[PDB]
């Protein structure tokens, strides 16, 4: 199983209420544990931010974030502003960086955008730190493992 804990990210100078007609919760909503960070007004500048989280627990933590692949180079400037958008993730053993791939696609559930997810396991008493310029699907809740379990794939009923 999985027990969640809030990572406590505050934001100022940007919008956090991105939503879509594909995550339909009595209207247009988004992922529950994620926040779609946007820019205040359309085409405005996204300010570069840095947000850390320290795994204060004894089990290892599971940090999950997303990258927003806009439909064009124009829509990316609409949501986050002109400029190259860049997300940088890093912990005591993790060192990567992510860039969105804005460009034409076919339609999937009537949308041509994509949102792709990445994950890393933060060690206990470690610190994850995000720096980002935009196009970042931020997390709100780290996940923790409860114990031991089995996992199968089937097409028959339980008993």
């Amino acid at each position, epitope marked *: 199983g999985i027990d969640k804990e809030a990572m406590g990210f505050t934001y100022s100078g940007i919008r956090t209420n991105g*939503a879509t*007609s594909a995550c339909r919760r009595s*209207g247009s909503s988004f992922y529950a544990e994620m926040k779609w960070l946007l820019s205040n007004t359309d*085409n405005a500048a996204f300010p570069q931010m840095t947000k850390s989280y320290k795994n204060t627990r004894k089990s290892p933590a599971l940090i999950v974030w997303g990258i927003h692949h806009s439909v064009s180079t124009a829509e990316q400037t609409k949501l986050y502003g002109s400029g190259n958008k860049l997300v940088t993730v890093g912990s005591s053993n993790y060192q990567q960086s992510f860039v969105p791939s804005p460009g034409a696609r076919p*339609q999937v559930n*009537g949308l041509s955008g994509r949102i792709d997810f990445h994950w890393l396991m933060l060690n206990p008493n470690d610190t994850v730190t995000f720096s980002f310029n935009g196009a970042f699907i931020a997390p709100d809740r780290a996940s923790f493992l409860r114990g031991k379990s089995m996992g199968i794939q089937s097409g028959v009923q339980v008993d």
Partner: antibody
Amino acid sequence: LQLQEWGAGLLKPSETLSLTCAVYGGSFSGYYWSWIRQPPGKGLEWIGEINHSGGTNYNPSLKSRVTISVDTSNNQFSLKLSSVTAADTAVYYCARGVWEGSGSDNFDYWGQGTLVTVSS
Amino acid sequence: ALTQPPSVSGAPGQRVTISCTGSSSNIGAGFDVHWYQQLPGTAPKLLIYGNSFRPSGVPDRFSGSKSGTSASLAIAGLQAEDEADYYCQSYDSSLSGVVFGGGTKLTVLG
């Protein structure tokens, strides 16, 4: 769905067009609520929108004139423009635009529109 | 910056096309084009959305498509209840806002 627009219908230039529009069910925070005008001759002009949180998305053409607000407790929202001119004579619809973005990708279930004549 | 023809004719049942000519700042970008039907006096109903998708209670007669910098609506099986004004609508980036067309006056014959 219910979508009712009401307000000052007969004004002269330099006055301030104030309208407002109320709803049924389908409440705020599911969608972006928008004001879209239409001069009686021809055309269809988007003028602004706003969500349950009060976040605005204005037309920059009409910005510095448009001010859009939301009575979330009474489930209605109001339009305040502007230092009005004569070319603002139009049928004004409020409409529910579906929240995609940051934005209002399409509009489903428009209101019925109230005519506003700003002749002299 | 969305150009539609003023008028299109057509006999009952025949197929007719309405063109939504756009620039590279609106349809040329990744933005989708929708359509709206405005019957006399009535307010516009939502028609084709997402360039090809139609909401509940819209017949197969109405079929939307999009190619490059233009879009097109198609009506097959014309009836009297189809005589109306039709508007295409998308989003423009250089103007930072959504944009409608001029409208097309569908006249069914008879």
